[model samples]
Target: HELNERQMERRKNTCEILLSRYKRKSFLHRIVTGDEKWIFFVNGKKTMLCVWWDQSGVIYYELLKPGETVNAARYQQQLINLNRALQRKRPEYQKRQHRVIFLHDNAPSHTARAVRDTLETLNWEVLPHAAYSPDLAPSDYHLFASMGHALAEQRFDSYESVKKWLDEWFAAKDDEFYWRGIHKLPERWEKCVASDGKYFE
Candidate 1:
């Protein structure tokens, strides 16, 4: 694909940040990567699904109510809730004083001033991500890659059914399934660096 020099520079910088600074597993486990998607139902309904996961597995996932959309203010509130969920789900992070490295792609809401302030309050380090590099996102190529197939022929009649199906699907995966996604990031970064930030499979 097409990438300008600025985009390529960001890709190189982001990859270098991880490749040069931290050990693979140490940095990988600390990451709390998240993203949002629209899940379509059979009745022509759709809902926004927001999820956060680490090497262990899913830390939290939320579905927006019908007819709702996310803005900077709404996403700021979600970030607050996500922090509380982190406390409830992974208390060890606080108890052990382990730092959290947050990874989420850049979107308008994600980069808004309020969102940055919220992240500052949470004290989590935001991992730098290159623009126009969807292939570099683990959620795109790994977790959600299989999710597409799982959801392909299946049709949900209501949000409840969709939620239930997603819950079961996430529950069925072993820890290694999630771990593999995070584990593959290093190789992906290396490939991106090798190709001068060109997009790749």
Candidate 2:
């Protein structure tokens, strides 16, 4: 009970803080959010027992190998690359064109001094996220939802093909798909506070 109550308190404060900061929709448009997930040539769900099969019979990955994990130093570089990629992909995200609102989570990799410093160097606002609130992250719940779900239980023979396929898939999505999520943020925030800090289910 105490834990739940405290969580609510924190979320309440978080929502209130955001409401005060983002008074206009234009500010929210400056938001570019990011996250990481480990994908494999062979990835599937496992119960207590499950099947493991790979059509190509060769292992492959991007950024992470079989035993490797992304750490703070690597994540910091990713942030730098992300800035470059956005400029390439989105006209509005050109550093001189727009002041970005970076919605990065507070993962230790993200909060490392190097990461924090790069965020400032990159530009404009980085919003303070509420603890354990990934549902509020559009990438987790909205942006990447379709892309990630399409890859589940599927086998990819090579990382290059996987990257190419994903890039094509994302490009095919209409801008409304992206804009819809951003347009929904204020509604989500209001719902969060209205529900006494519960997730906006």
Candidate 3:
């Protein structure tokens, strides 16, 4: 359902607040987002860990077990790994002492104390979601779907077979592809408010 008058107005007000701060030069670079996605056994299934500024560092994990899902600890562990990976990507981020503004949904694991504590220890600032982004992830509209479309008709017998295909796909994309998706956020912000926050066209 489209957001009603009250809901739509509330979102507009909130978006304005977020944008006022987001427009500040340093904030957007520090912003990062993540989410878990199911990688079906036969089809391609994986969890993607990514930071907006570093297009090359989108980390994908192949979930091998049937019941495997990211819990608080696993999520925290991935954050730890990402910390190392980001540090590796730009040592100057650490050498110069930089930080992150982590955005995530109110998932149980995301809000768990264990997860929160981990961010605290790393000095990464957590922003309690002041607003909703479609796809339960920031820019989910393009990130996964754009990648998923290519592999749609390709059949796979094993999970690894599907996983390997994605590995190649992610490597093939240039920073420009990621830049396209990342920069759309502000434009979508305007659209979200104009369209009453309904799913994007």
Candidate 4:
């Protein structure tokens, strides 16, 4: 479905947010973006992979239990896990006083009051994100696009097999791979504004 006027306004606001953040050098360096994707197996079973990453590389990623869906509580817990992972993997980020700026979609689970309070308690900034704007999401337009291509026509016998494949795929990506995905966001934001908040090919 296309975005209505309200959603378009929200999209434009998010674009401005990105552009302003870009103007502040090093803001992008502190951003940690997360998203969830469903990976389907040959037996009609699927698992949701919740992943968080920065320009350096993947910070945390885990597969949800088969048939599990994220609720506000689960999402908040994932954020806590992500916080711990970030502290361990990117200690310099905190030591250097570069606060984390989290970026995620405005899904119901993500926007729930509990999630918002959790984010506030963590003291990490949340990037303004508009609903239904996958093009503005790095996981959708960049990371997951390549992942989908890589998994196309592939068969996994079991969930463990799928995990191994996913592990291998993530390990193969270098830091530059993730950096490119994040750097592309600025250009995409520019395009979004040029298109007058409409979806562009």
Candidate 5:
């Protein structure tokens, strides 16, 4: 089903509001100085999907078990996980001197009422991004690229082997590597929005 004119207008209005509030210089500068900002992570393997967002050293992770194909449900679970993780990580964040923002993609899951409700309940603002732009998603632009290099030409004889490989590769990633990848977000976002539907390369 296509969005009606009214729905499209509402979306445009929302986008305008979001764009007005986005302070690229402030956001990027604060992030570069490690002042605390949102970072998004997502992973899917076999029948499971995980989505997470973190800021100021606080982390949230959600898991989707097998046979659960509903995006809304998965996103709701992620929101719950975020709340719980924030409860635990907030004090720790204070000790580490980090601020926070929340980032997510344009996925239906991320935009669902359940997800939005949790953000509202927690008084957290969602980071804005252009729609239908995969380049702005860190999982696609950075994490998977690293994983591809890490697993390049590696043979896994079984599911267990593949899982082990993933664990090892992720575990081996250092903080600097993650920070470097996260720092590329602004550039990716700029390119994506500018390119419209064309390839950004």
Candidate 6:
């Protein structure tokens, strides 16, 4: 769906606000980034996982069921649910952050009309040209890579076992781990902004 002038204005304003806030932080406040990845186990068995993270920690994660796909409508609802949960658990974040910026890959489904409408209604911003570049996404270059190494050659007895492992791994992660990934966002942003629609090298 094409965005109208008003919607485009809102998006631009939201991005400006977020970028300014990110730059003005006294102690380097958190930078939010999001991504979806397919986790393959049992030799190519796949699970779709969507995740959002900041300097503080992993904010939310959802593992898509087998054969399920994340379309724009579905992603909008997921984002709405995530915002609701954030409001409930961390109302302060809403107040302090002012606007939330979501980073997503360039999948066609991600740019659906429904998704854009939802984001505009919620006053959220999306990182520009996220789909054309993957290396700029920390989850691709770091988080998932780290997780893959950590879980290397491991076998889970059942679905529940995998869930347990996920919970444990996330729970054990410290602020250092989260920050290390998030702190790289500025560099990623610089690369994306400079790349002229190419993936950052």
Tens-digit lDDT track of model 2 for 89-179: 5666564777767676677877888878887887547787877776677766675566578878567766555676655666677777777
Which pairs clash (backbone N, Cα, C closer than 3 Å) in model 1?
none
Which runs in model 3 stand beyond 4 Å of their true positions? 1-10, 43-64, 128-132
lDDT of 4 at 123: 85
**How does model 3 score by TM-score?**
0.79
Give the C-alpha lDDT of model 4: 0.88
TM per prediction? 0.93, 0.78, 0.79, 0.94, 0.63, 0.75
- Ranking according to lDDT, highest score first: 4, 1, 6, 2, 3, 5
Q: lDDT value for candidate 1?
A: 0.85
Location of the lowest summed lDDT over 10 successive residues in candidate 6: 191-200
- From the highest TM-score down, the ranking of the candidates is 4, 1, 3, 2, 6, 5
Clash totals, every prediction = 0, 0, 1, 0, 0, 1
Give, for candidate 1, the lowest lDDT window spanning 10 residues: 17-26
- Candidate maximizing TM-score: 4
RMSD vs true structure, all candidates: 1.7, 8.0, 3.5, 1.4, 7.2, 6.4
In candidate 1, what are the lDDT values of residues 1-201, reduced to their tens digit? 689898888898788777876564457878888888888886667888888898888888888886578889988988888888888888778585788889899988999999999999888999988888777788777888888899887888898988998999999999999999988888888888888777766
Residue 102, model 5, lDDT: 62
Error of 1 at 67 (Å): 4.4
Is 2 or 5 the stronger prediction by TM-score? 2
2 Cα displacement, candidate 4 (Å): 2.2
Residue pairs whose backbone atoms clash in candidate 3? 39-45
- Local distance difference test scores for all models: 0.85, 0.62, 0.61, 0.88, 0.50, 0.67
